[PDB]
Design a binder for these strands. Structure first.
Ligand SMILES: O=P(O)(O)O[C@H]1[C@H](OP(=O)(O)O)[C@@H](OP(=O)(O)O)[C@H](OP(=O)(O)O)[C@@H](OP(=O)(O)O)[C@H]1OP(=O)(O)O
Lengths: 530, 492
DNA sequence: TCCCTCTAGATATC
DNA sequence: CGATATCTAGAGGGAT
């Protein structure tokens, strides 16, 4: 169904303290909240969003009785997000001049979750706190806070101006605030949130504490909100006497814009005014209109045109048995190169839910395939109407689960045998020693990974697979700008998008000299003829 | 424009000898190869022009009435009737019919053969792009006893090359070996080896008949200044069932279709500037076409180099869409090939992949791709199995990856893993990229063949993708029972 | 001019 | 049992 999310944002006086050259924590938190609400609104999710601000000049919460929980305001209650919330976030919300306990704000958010969810059903209750932890706070309510979070099944996430684990660029890769450059109050707040997140879920609590710049280039805000995919039940058959009940999920599937652009009149802005239609005419000269009743579909077989009615086509089309996941045979993993992978999806195949025997059988098959370094060539058909496919199911073993990964393999008609001239045995295009040395230096300098910690672990300096698609955020920004400012032109791409789409500045700085050497060693002239 | 291919098959007395071998004679070899080429052209709906000419025969048929030259098919698009006429010569009975109606073993001169080929090439009144002749013969010195004939053939090959057509020879198996350098070195335009298997000759033909059409000629930008030009090719492209064409009911010619848009009230035609694009969220957004395109624009088309990443960081299970191939294009930027070769050599040596931002065309969001360095590898027949260059691997974004429900990891005992190892080893088989055909396309084109030739019952295709259930059951023996005993409970 | 990609719309099936 | 997914069908940019 849906989930209830409460956003607890710090608007205190210290949140506006802007170090020169770096955006203030208030602005970064506003950007993160704006991105979250934009995705929730323009994807038309049914999730419920509430906004709680602590540190405001005023006080508006259902706990103020007794001069308690002061300077905490519930800006928006649990309801479907709309453009009013986005407009309020962008302009209406202003930083305050007071200071509020972030634990008291967490209590207020928990109360909002507990009270406003009565009646409605929510699979997940999530609270996200945006703060800098640079304010005095009390620890008397900690134990009951943890108890209420655990017993009410409420998730938690924390966003801070500084990361937990040169020039600073918002949304960049690698720069972070100096951990020794934070105040003692910030250190105490960090210790307290660390202990809270240890209590809530364990060692992953550190993994669930993010920074504004880091979160701007990740989907961590929606991590506790994403709905799981639907399994595809089938049986993995090896022959006719061996069958294993399996469930398949789409691990990789390209995301597309669900909403579609509707063509409307430029004056009335109505779809019904415009109407399109197709009229058929003879392709030769003196074109005459051809009525629908004179139209019969056909097919091209070489130079011959073959009439073929739809009923006949469905009668004598290829018919498959139906659902199937059948092993054709096992081949060495070296014979299946990844350059032949086809299709537009990747399936991870698990055993059937709550099936110990199926789990044992699939684990046996996976471990046998892994030990012998073999893969399974399988025939895959989604249903009775889908075209059968041939693919490879190779083992994928992790510390928490095991599965088979299915990627479709090509047919004979899908291959194209082009002839390309060799580059090694070319006397005209053979680079000299100096050119090879220059390219070696460039490759060394422009490296995107390092062997840090001396533990033989490769650190990725540019993990692009964790970066969200910039098109969605850009489209959401443009749509929001058009909705709020109809008369203004579209805004330029946000700077943090470019920062997250570019390699770290250290790589660019290192690549200066080798690139100049390459330019002076490789002559490149554009052609003017042909 | 169009490009045309002429198949030139030798009908000499030595082409019908099996050489005490169980495999097909070289004549049947060539006939089946030409048939497979015709079928492949029809499947892909290619606009190629194909012709089949036999030389060394008794009976002759051509425009110039040259002796011992017979043109079975002129330059025209392939069709069902042509494939049937070619099948007439297939097999032992087909060879017999070929001898009866055709003749063999007569004397010939190559100069007249290439003259007839040139006349056939000039006969077609079409936009001719490239003209090619494939010569099927197992004779390495056709004119070893006639120096004048050899000189005339060499001169004809020379001025035919100067005309602008290509002439590649596909030598077949001959006892004692085939020597290209003997007489055919100076005629054809390293080289492949002899043909001893049908799919060998098929691959050798397809490696030359097919022409590379670049998907896009982009620019690989190392930085703002160092820019080289590369071509993008799709080495794998999912074959699609051809769309149907609407036809007139009685006359069956294709009918042109066009779309006209108007206003439902006035009825007059409206320009694209007379409409806008709209989206409704809740109870709410008007955008122009130009704005809808502009919001999708990030970078100029091309590849922008971000850095080099070790190959161990590219997960095999992160596949997103079929990969592309990157090769230098010296036509656009002079000196691109040298830099491309140096980059390929150094990337192969260091086992790193170039990470780039990929923009296919204007007004499209960028995608991160990895240029995996790939080295040329040849076959024992000198067939280029893998071209040299970079493989463009698409990297998924965070949105493309999908989280999945978790379960407790249940491990298997070593005995069960051993039984599964035995089962896997029993069903071991060698996999090749062309081991399977598309059942849907095969059945569709079988039905089309039956309808075109007015056959009452179409030939039923054999599904090679279906597992050999009986064969695999026999091969596995009783291992399945032991595996079920060790894994499955008695009640299940 | 045609191929490939993108984007809409339809729909039988689990 | 209906919402998800797959096959199928129309425009647009670019190499030829
Ligand atoms: O950066 P990577 O080396 O590619 O690691 C990824 C990443 O996880 P970690 O960085 O925490 O290890 C994926 O999750 P994201 O952080 O990108 O959201 C995770 O996905 P799943 O475990 O959910 O599948 C994936 O795992 P897998 O290989 O099963 O796809 C895992 O890969 P590795 O653990 O092998 O590094």
């Amino acid at each position: 169904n849906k989930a209830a999310v409460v956003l607890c944002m710090d608007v205190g006086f210290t949140m506006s303290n802007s170090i020169p050259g770096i955006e203030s924590p208030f602005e970064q938190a506003k950007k993160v909240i704006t991105m979250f609400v934009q995705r929730q609104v323009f994807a038309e999710n049914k999730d419920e969003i509430a906004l709680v601000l602590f540190g405001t000049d005023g006080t508006d919460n259902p706990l103020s009785g007794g001069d308690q929980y002061q300077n905490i305001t519930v800006h928006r209650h649990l309801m479907l997000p709309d453009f009013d919330l986005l407009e309020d976030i962008e302009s209406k919300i202003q930083p305050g001049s007071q200071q509020a306990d972030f634990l008291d704000a967490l209590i207020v958010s928990m109360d909002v979750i507990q009270h406003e969810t009565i009646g409605k059903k929510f699979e997940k209750r999530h609270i996200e706190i945006f703060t800098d932890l640079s304010s005095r706070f009390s620890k008397s309510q900690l134990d009951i806070i943890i108890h209420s979070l655990k017993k009410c099944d409420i998730s938690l996430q924390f966003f801070l101006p500084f990361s937990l684990g040169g020039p600073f660029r918002l949304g960049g890769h690698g720069p972070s605030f100096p951990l020794k450059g934070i105040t003692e109050q910030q250190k105490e707040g960090l210790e307290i949130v660390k202990m809270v997140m240890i209590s809530l879920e364990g060692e992953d609590g550190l993994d669930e504490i993010y920074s504004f710049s880091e979160s701007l280039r990740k989907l961590c805000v929606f991590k506790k909100i994403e709905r799981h995919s639907i399994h595809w039940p089938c049986r993995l058959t090896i022959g006719s006497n061996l069958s294993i009940r399996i469930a398949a999920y789409k691990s990789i599937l390209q995301e597309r814009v669900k909403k579609t652009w509707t063509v409307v009149d430029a004056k009335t802005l109505k779809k019904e005014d415009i109407q399109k239609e197709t009229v058929y005419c003879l392709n030769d000269d003196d074109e005459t209109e051809v009525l629908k009743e004179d139209i019969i579909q056909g097919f091209r077989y070489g130079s011959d045109i073959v009439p073929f009615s739809k009923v006949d086509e469905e009668q004598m089309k290829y018919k498959s048995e139906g659902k199937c996941f059948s092993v054709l045979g096992f081949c060495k993993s070296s014979q299946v190169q990844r350059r032949f992978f086809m299709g537009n999806q990747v399936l991870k195949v698990f055993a059937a839910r709550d099936d110990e025997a199926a789990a044992v059988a699939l684990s046996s098959l996976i471990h046998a395939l892994d030990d012998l370094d073999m893969v399974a060539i399988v025939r895959y058909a989604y249903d009775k109407r889908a075209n059968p496919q041939v693919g490879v199911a190779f083992p994928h073993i992790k510390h928490n689960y095991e599965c088979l990964v299915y990627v479709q393999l090509p047919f004979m008609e899908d291959l194209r045998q082009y002839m390309f001239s060799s580059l090694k045995n070319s006397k005209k295009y053979a680079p000299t020693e100096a050119q090879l040395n220059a390219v070696d230096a460039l490759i060394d300098s422009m490296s995107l990974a390092k062997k840090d910690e001396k533990t033989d672990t490769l650190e990725d300096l540019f993990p692009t697979t964790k970066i969200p698609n910039p098109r969605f955020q850009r489209l959401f920004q443009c749509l929001l700008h058009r909705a709020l400012h109809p008369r203004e032109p579209l805004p330029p791409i946000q700077q943090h998008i470019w920062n997250m789409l570019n390699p770290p500045a250290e790589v660019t700085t290192k690549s200066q000299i080798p690139l100049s050497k390459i330019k002076t060693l490789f002559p490149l002239i554009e052609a003017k003829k042909k | 424009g169009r490009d045309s291919l002429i198949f030139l098959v030798d009908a000499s007395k030595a082409m019908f000898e099996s050489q005490s071998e169980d495999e097909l004679t070289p004549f049947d070899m060539s006939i089946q190869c030409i048939q497979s080429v015709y079928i492949s052209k029809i499947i892909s709906s290619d606009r190629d022009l194909l012709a089949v000419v036999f030389y060394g025969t008794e009976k002759d048929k051509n425009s110039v009435n040259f002796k011992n030259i017979y043109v079975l098919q002129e330059l025209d698009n392939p069709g069902a009737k042509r494939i049937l006429e070619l099948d007439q010569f297939k097999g032992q009975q087909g060879q017999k019919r070929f001898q009866d109606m055709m003749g063999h073993g007569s004397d010939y001169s190559l100069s007249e053969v290439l003259w007839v080929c040139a006349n056939l090439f000039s006969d077609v009144q079409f936009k001719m792009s490239h003209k090619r002749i494939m010569l099927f013969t197992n004779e390495d010195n056709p004119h070893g006893n006639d120096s004048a004939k050899a000189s005339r053939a060499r001169t004809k090959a020379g001025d035919l090359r100067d005309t602008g057509i290509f002439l590649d020879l596909m030598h077949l198996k001959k006892p004692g070996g085939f020597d290209i350098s003997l007489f055919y070195r100076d005629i054809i335009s390293v080289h492949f080896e002899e043909s001893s298997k049908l799919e060998d000759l098929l691959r050798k033909v397809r490696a030359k008949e097919t022409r590379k059409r670049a998907l896009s000629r982009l620019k690989l930008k190392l930085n703002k200044d160092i820019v080289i030009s590369v071509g993008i090719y799709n080495l794998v492209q999912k074959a699609l069932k051809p769309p149907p064409i609407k036809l007139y009911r009685e006359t069956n010619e294709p009918v042109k279709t066009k779309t006209r848009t108007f206003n439902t009230s006035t009825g007059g035609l409206l320009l694209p500037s007379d409409t806008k694009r709209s989206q409704i969220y809740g109870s709410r957004i008007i955008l122009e076409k130009e704005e809808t395109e502009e919001l999708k624009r990030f970078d100029d088309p091309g590849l922008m180099l971000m850095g080099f990443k070790p190959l161990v960081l590219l997960k095999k299970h992160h596949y997103l869409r079929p990969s592309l191939f990157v090769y230098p294009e010296e036509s656009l930027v002079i000196g691109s090939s040298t830099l491309f070769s140096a980059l390929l050599i150094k990337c192969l040596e260091k086992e790193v992949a170039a990470l780039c931002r990929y923009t296919p065309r204007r007004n499209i969001p960028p995608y991160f791709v990895a240029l995996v360095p790939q080295e040329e590898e040849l076959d024992d027949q000198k067939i280029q199995v893998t071209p040299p260059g970079f493989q463009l691997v698409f990297l998924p974004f965070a949105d493309d990856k999908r989280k999945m429900p978790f379960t407790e990891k249940i491990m298997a005992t070593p005995e069960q893993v051993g039984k599964m190892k035995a089962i896997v080893e029993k069903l071991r088989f060698t996999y090749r990229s062309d081991s399977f055909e598309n059942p849907v396309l095969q059945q569709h084109f079988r039905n089309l063949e039956a309808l075109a030739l007015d056959l009452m019952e179409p030939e039923q295709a054999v599904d090679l993708t279906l597992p050999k259930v009986e064969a695999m059951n026999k091969r596995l023996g009783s291992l399945v029972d032991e595996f079920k005993e060790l894994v499955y409970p008695p009640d299940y």
